[PDB]
Amino acid sequence: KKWLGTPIEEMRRMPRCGIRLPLLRPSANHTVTIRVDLLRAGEVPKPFPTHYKDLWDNKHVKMPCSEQNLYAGSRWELIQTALLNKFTRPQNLKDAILKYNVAYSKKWDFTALIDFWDKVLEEAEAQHLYQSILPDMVKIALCLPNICTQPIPLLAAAMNHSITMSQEQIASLLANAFFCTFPRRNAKMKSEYSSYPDINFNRLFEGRSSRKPEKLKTLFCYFRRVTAAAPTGLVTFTRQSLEDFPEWERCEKPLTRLHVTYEGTIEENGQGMLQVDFANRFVGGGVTSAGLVQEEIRFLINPELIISRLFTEVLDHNECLIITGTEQYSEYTGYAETYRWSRSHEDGSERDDWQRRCTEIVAIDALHFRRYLDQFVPEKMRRELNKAYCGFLRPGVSSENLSAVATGNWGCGAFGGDARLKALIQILAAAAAERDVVYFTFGDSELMRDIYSMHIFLTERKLTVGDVYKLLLRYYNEECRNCTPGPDIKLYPFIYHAVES
Numbered sequence: 001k002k003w004l005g006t007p008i009e010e011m012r013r014m015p016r017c018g019i020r021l022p023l024l025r026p027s028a029n030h031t032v033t034i035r036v037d038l039l040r041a042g043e044v045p046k047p048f049p050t051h052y053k054d055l056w057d058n059k060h061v062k063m064p065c066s067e068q069n070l071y072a073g074s075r076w077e078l079i080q081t082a083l084l085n086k087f088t089r090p091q092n093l094k095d096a097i098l099k100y101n102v103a104y105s106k107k108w109d110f111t112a113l114i115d116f117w118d119k120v121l122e123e124a125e126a127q128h129l130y131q132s133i134l135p136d137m138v139k140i141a142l143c144l145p146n147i148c149t150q151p152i153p154l155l156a157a158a159m160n161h162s163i164t165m166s167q168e169q170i171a172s173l174l175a176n177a178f179f180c181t182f183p184r185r186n187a188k189m190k191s192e193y194s195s196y197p198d199i200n201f202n203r204l205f206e207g208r209s210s211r212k213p214e215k216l217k218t219l220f221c222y223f224r225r226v227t228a229a230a231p232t233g234l235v236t237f238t239r240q241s242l243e244d245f246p247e248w249e250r251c252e253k254p255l256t257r258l259h260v261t262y263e264g265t266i267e268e269n270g271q272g273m274l275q276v277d278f279a280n281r282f283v284g285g286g287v288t289s290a291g292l293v294q295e296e297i298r299f300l301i302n303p304e305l306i307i308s309r310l311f312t313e314v315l316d317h318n319e320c321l322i323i324t325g326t327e328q329y330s331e332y333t334g335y336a337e338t339y340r341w342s343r344s345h346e347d348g349s350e351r352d353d354w355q356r357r358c359t360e361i362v363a364i365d366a367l368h369f370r371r372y373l374d375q376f377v378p379e380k381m382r383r384e385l386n387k388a389y390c391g392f393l394r395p396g397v398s399s400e401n402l403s404a405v406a407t408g409n410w411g412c413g414a415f416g417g418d419a420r421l422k423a424l425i426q427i428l429a430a431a432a433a434e435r436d437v438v439y440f441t442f443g444d445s446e447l448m449r450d451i452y453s454m455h456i457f458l459t460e461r462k463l464t465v466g467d468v469y470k471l472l473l474r475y476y477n478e479e480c481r482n483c484t485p486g487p488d489i490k491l492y493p494f495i496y497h498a499v500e501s
């Protein structure tokens with residue numbers, strides 16, 4: 001079979017499973033950058049406040065249009081002068097960006113941007129780029145102070161805080177990121193913002209990887225769409241940090257349901273489910289540089305995700321980022337060296353009562369394991385359980401109103417994670433958060449069968465979360481702690497034998 005377990009049609013999905021949303025309102029823990037009283041389906045949201053207000057401090061985004069962005073001269077005036085010039089050749093765009101980035105004129109390479117424009121695009125495509133797309137991107141970037149009128153707080157470590165902004169606001173911010181206008185976000189040896197991801201796009205322009213043209217095609221598809229017709233919805237970014245984590249060995253909860261399949265993807269076949277982003281602790285990973293696996297791909301096809309890098313501090317072990325409302329603008333095939341932009345995508349997702357696409361993505365970063373056996377250390381297993389639990393738990397929500405989790409081999413492949421361990425870890429965290437699991441093994445049919453078989457074995461024997469966790473601890477002591485780079489017996493065979501004996 002191509003899938004095993006509970007039929008996916010029986011799993012909960014938004015919007016059907018959700019409760020009616022409360023009235024959208026700003027508060028101490030929720031920044032809302034648009035006029036809620038004027039929010040109407042199909043209408044571009046109106047910014048609140050009406051006139052630009054600036055904060056230039058350690059708790060908010062430093063906006064390029066701030067009067068405090070100086071060089072003294074006004075860097076925003078210099079950005080305007082630089083970008084309001086005709087572009088006909090890629091050197092013109094390089095020269096423009098460097099006019100307000102003089103300190104980086106010898107550090108920043110533009111080879112990929114030059115090669116995209118001169119050596120990848122056909123003549124008519126290049127002409128469309130410089131006669132239409134780039135000027136429209138400049139115009140939306142320079143409109144920033146009229147679009148993003150409210151200071152944007154940083155989602156800093158240990159904050160439980162949400163930001164809800166319009167897709168149009170995100171588009172203006174991302175156009176600024178493309179033109180590398182965000183101040184204090186560039187230096188290799190910076191102290192301020194050293195714990196934040198890169199936001200300016202200069203590393204997308206570096207080098208000769210065949211991957212860069214594909215990334216640029218994907219992002220220009222987005223920019224062409226959102227400059228031609230303003231998107232009308234909202235997106236919410238929520239940093240969540242939990243303090244009370246389960247005593248896993250004592251957890252008496254049963255496992256929940258499982259659908260596991262070797263076909264399909266999280267983003268296409270997990271519509272309306274909690275979709276896992278296999279994140280880097282710096283959210284988005286190398287999306288703005290050289291990375292092109294699961295997280296970076298999702299950030300390219302749903303580029304509104306990228307703006308999380310503007311304001312999201314690196315995730316600590318007990319934290320996640322939850323993004324609701326991002327829209328899919330592109331389709332793709334492959335990954336890494338085989339990644340290719342396929343075509344524009346018209347997102348057909350319903351919107352919720354806050355005009356957010358019914359798409360919820362959670363960024364949870366797995367650990368990297370240089371040594372395979374390090375991941376079976378109890379402290380490391382508990383770390384991964386608590387990370388996934390934080391990503392899945394919604395404190396004030398009945399289980400009946402929680403969608404299934406759509407996930408897969410989180411932290412595996414090149415990152416060193418063991419897929420069978422990581423599947424069981426996510427199954428346990430989902431059970432503790434009272435959510436069902438939809439697991440995509442991404443072509444591995446044997447893994448599908450193994451996960452299904454283990455799940456059915458444990459559920460039929462009524463093993464609790466704590467019973468299973470204790471078996472993981474036994475496996476570590478018996479096969480890992482005193483162990484060769486690999487254990488003598490694998491995890492699932494160990495579990496089967498331990499339980500049946």
Ligand SMILES: Cn1c(=S)c2[nH]c(SCC(=O)N3CCOCC3)nc2n(C)c1=O
Pocket residue numbers: 264265266267292293294295297335407408409410412413414415440441442
């Ligand atoms: C479940 N699922 C999975 S697993 C997935 N993987 C990728 S890209 C390859 C990748 O991330 N690697 C390979 C080794 O290097 C480290 C990790 N896209 C994915 N999608 C869309 C998905 O739904």
Ligand SMILES: C[As](C)(=O)[O-]
Pocket residue numbers: 482
């Ligand atoms: C003596 As021992 C197996 O607890 O390291």
